[PDB]
Design a protein around this ligand. Structure first.
Ligand SMILES: [Cl-]
Length: 119
C-alpha cells in the first residue's frame, strides 16, 4: 500500500549521493538506483495489503549494499580508472554495466527479504 511506498522511500533517502562529484557520474549513479531499485521495489510494495510489515533489517542491508556498489562505480569512474583519463566518460561507461548488474542483484536479494511477520 501507499504506506509501504513511503517506508521504502524513507530507506532510499538514506542512499546518499555526494553532490560534489562530477554531474556526468551523478546522473548515471542516480539513474542506476532509480531504474534497478526504486521503480521495481516501489511497484512491488504498492501491492501489499494495508498491514503488511516490512523487514527493517532487509531495508538496512539494501542501503549498505547500494552504498558499497555505488562507491565501487565511483572508483571506476575516477581514482581507480587506469584504462582512460580519470573522470572521463570512457571510464564511466566501462564501469557502468557492472554497476547496473550489481544493483539488479541487490534488487533480487531485497525482494526475498522485504516482508516479515506481524508482532
Ligand atoms: Cl526506522
Amino acid at each position: 500500500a501507499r504506506k509501504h511506498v513511503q517506508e521504502l522511500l524513507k530507506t532510499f533517502r538514506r542512499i546518499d549521493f555526494d553532490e560534489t562529484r562530477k554531474s556526468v557520474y551523478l546522473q548515471s549513479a542516480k539513474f542506476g538506483v532509480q531504474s534497478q531499485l526504486r521503480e521495481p521495489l516501489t511497484k512491488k510494495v504498492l501491492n501489499y495489503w494495508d498491514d503488511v510489515k516490512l523487514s527493517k533489517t532487509c531495508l538496512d542491508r539494501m542501503v549498505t549494499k547500494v552504498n558499497d556498489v555505488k562507491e565501487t562505480f565511483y572508483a571506476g569512474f575516477s581514482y581507480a580508472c587506469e584504462s582512460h583519463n580519470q573522470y572521463s566518460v570512457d571510464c564511466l561507461e566501462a564501469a557502468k554495466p557492472s554497476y547496473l548488474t550489481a544493483l539488479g542483484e541487490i534488487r533480487g536479494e531485497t525482494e526475498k527479504c522485504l516482508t516479515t511477520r506481524l508482532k
